[PDB]
């Protein structure tokens, strides 16, 4: 065996090729953060990675057979890979443990190794296997079965009681979160079905992730989801077929147009306490700023349509789709200088202006306004312009606006931010905390606010904050509609947080219903601000399925929707 290390490898994590049996060791004085395996290699080459360093290392797994994107290497871990020319990948050799009693229930003993494999065979089988609780945080386990008689995993310590059944070919990856005391699914090998095999309906699901393919020669005209499943089971519906198909709305928590066109993909997730399939992913038809926009918008062939008006595709009037289903949404953005009128069959008649985002939703009585435009005045301190640059400072605030509108749109929040003015000015204040106060009376910013009819004002400064880099009045009147962040410690993601305060939201743990949702698998804007959502009991974590709120206790979107229009009318024509 050949022993190598970063100091013996030009202080690089690129494990070199040419060795039939290589051992790459990491230590406290000999360490690198990012590691990778060589692409060029011979068939039976062996590489073993060991680590005794206090700092963790991370391995690129793009040329391996591990479905995870990155491997976390800790002190005491021993990873072994064997190349394979037939597959052109490094095959991992994980510590394997198997059930040994042919009984109905067996607890699986796990070591302290970060990555382990639980493997079920014909001769090593159990009706129900249980993963142990309270193991080292971050422990990742691959559960795989090659047996011909099926088994399943005990659901007590699993994040959700999904259909974790194990047949020949099943593969589930779990990671234990001590903050939750639960094994959380990180990768689920999908059960693939051709719709020609099952027809126009699926009576029941067999695994946590079912993938139904449509194609030419494999196609039906309509498809009905199961009436029931286990909690957080998922169904993905894909099409490569020429001719469209319809996903029936029965058993789904949506009346929208679920038309399955070429290249479309839909994802559904069952919710036990509600008893239906939640629609968590659906296509959006986009007519962008370079494409031609029809005067009469096309009939809905998917749940959402977004139209991007520009100077080169400007249209004087737009007619909302004549045929649609309840829940269908139309989002219109305008970067053209002239206005565009929007009309619907029910008599709805309005206009969209330059820089404005507008969303409409279809109801039983026609199209309906689904968003209110809050005009904002962007103020940048000259100190910030000197550090970032005149153009850069404007760029920083615009990205804050775009992220806020993206977060609001993902949350069904009925508001968009529109910047109607940008001024360079220093609010007289020694601190950011002081600036948020005097900015309400500052003659320079308030005259400009009135001149351009800005519903609110936002300030980007370089003053030190008194215990934090952002400030904003909570549930702000027209007089208090102001928010601020700095550049020292706050990024452009702070705007959607401060504007949330202006809209009436509090941090997680607050007694108010308009508060954030904090969770180790993803926290909303007011409750940690690491996912693009405001909290709501009708929103779910895209990857893990955790409900982002609670009916009557944690619902930020319900408070936003009660204040959005009132704030949008602070300044008007």
């Amino acid at each position: 065996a050949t022993v190598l290390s970063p100091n013996q490898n030009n202080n690089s994590g690129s494990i070199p090729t040419g060795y039939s049996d290589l051992e790459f060791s990491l230590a406290n004085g000999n360490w690198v953060k990012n590691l990778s395996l060589p692409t060029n290699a011979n068939n039976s080459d062996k590489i073993t990675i060991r680590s005794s360093a206090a700092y963790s290392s991370y391995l690129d797994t793009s040329n391996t057979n591990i479905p995870l994107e990155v491997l976390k290497i800790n002190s005491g871990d021993v990873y072994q890979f064997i190349f394979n020319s037939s597959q052109n990948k490094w095959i991992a050799q994980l510590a394997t443990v198997s059930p040994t009693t042919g009984s109905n229930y067996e607890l699986i003993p796990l070591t302290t190794a970060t990555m382990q494999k639980v493997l079920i065979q014909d001769d090593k089988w159990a009706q129900t296997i249980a993963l142990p609780s309270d193991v080292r945080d971050g422990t990742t386990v691959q559960v795989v079965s090659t047996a011909s008689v099926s088994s399943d995993i005990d659901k007590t310590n699993l994040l959700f009681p999904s259909s974790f059944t194990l047949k020949n070919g099943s593969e589930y990856w779990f990671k234990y979160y001590s903050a939750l005391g639960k094994w959380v699914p990180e990768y689920i090998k999908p059960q693939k079905l051709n719709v020609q095999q099952i027809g126009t309906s699926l009576a029941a699901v067999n695994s946590p992730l079912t993938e139904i393919a449509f194609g030419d020669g494999n196609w039906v005209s309509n498809f009905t989801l199961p009436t029931t499943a286990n909690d957080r089971d998922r169904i993905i519906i894909k099409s490569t077929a020429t001719w469209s198909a319809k996903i029936n709305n029965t058993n789904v928590n949506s009346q929208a147009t679920l038309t399955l066109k070429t290249g479309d993909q839909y994802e559904f997730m069952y919710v036990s306490d509600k008893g239906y399939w939640q629609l968590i992913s659906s296509p959006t038809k986009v007519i962008d700023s370079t494409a031609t926009i029809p005067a009469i918008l096309p009939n809905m062939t998917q749940p959402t349509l977004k139209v991007k008006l520009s100077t080169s595709n400007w249209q004087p009037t737009l007619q909302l789709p004549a045929q649609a289903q309840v829940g269908d949404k139309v989002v219109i953005v305008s970067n053209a200088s002239a206005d565009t009128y929007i009309n619907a069959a029910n008599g709805l008649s309005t206009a969209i202006k330059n820089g404005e985002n507008r969303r409409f939703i279809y109801t039983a009585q026609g199209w309906t306004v689904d968003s209110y435009t809050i005009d904002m005045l962007l103020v940048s301190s000259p100190e910030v312009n000197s550090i970032l640059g005149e153009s850069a400072a404007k760029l920083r605030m615009i990205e804050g606006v775009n992220l806020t509108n993206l977060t609001a749109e993902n949350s069904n929040a009925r508001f968009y931010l529109r910047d109607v003015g940008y001024i360079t000015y220093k609010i007289p204040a020694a601190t950011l905390k002081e600036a948020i106060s005097t900015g309400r009376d500052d003659t320079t910013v308030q005259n400009e606010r009135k001149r351009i009819l800005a519903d609110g004002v936002y300030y980007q400064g370089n003053e030190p904050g008194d215990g934090g880099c952002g400030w904003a009045w909570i549930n702000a009147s027209a007089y208090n509609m102001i928010g601020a962040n700095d550049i020292a410690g706050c990024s452009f993601a702070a705007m959607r947080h401060e504007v949330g305060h202006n809209l009436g939201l509090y941090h997680n743990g607050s007694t108010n219903i308009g508060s954030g949702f904090a969770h180790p698998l993803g926290s909303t804007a007011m409750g940690g601000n690491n996912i693009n959502f405001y909290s709501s009991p009708y929103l779910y974590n895209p990857k893990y399925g955790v409900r982002l709120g609670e009916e009557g206790k944690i619902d930020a979107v319900s408070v936003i929707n009660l204040n959005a229009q009132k704030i949008s009318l602070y300044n008007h024509h």
Partner: protein, 128 residues
Amino acid sequence: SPSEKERLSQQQIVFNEVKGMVIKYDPKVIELKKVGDTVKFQMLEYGINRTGKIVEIEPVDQDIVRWTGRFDQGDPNQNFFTITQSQKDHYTIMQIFTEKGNYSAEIKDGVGLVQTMDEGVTDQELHH
């Protein structure tokens, strides 16, 4: 901008490792990318190692251009990334939206900082 034997260099990696994660960045790599070219992100400490393709290049003004792309193996309906870059000030902002998390990158004069969006704001509730 014009040069020889180097303009052909088309690396898929956008930035390189060296509160958050310090990175080095070359603004000339993205400026040589056209609609359809492949772009790669490496944030191994955050568990992100994936590629993507440029789908949209949009001039936002005379000085700022925005690149938009989608990832090859994510969720095609939700995941995407944006690179918005000013030329006059060597300043670039990146929005990387994946199902595993959201990451922002703020770069100035070739050096930048990537962090999870939870690091983007810390503040206290303000009272009267």
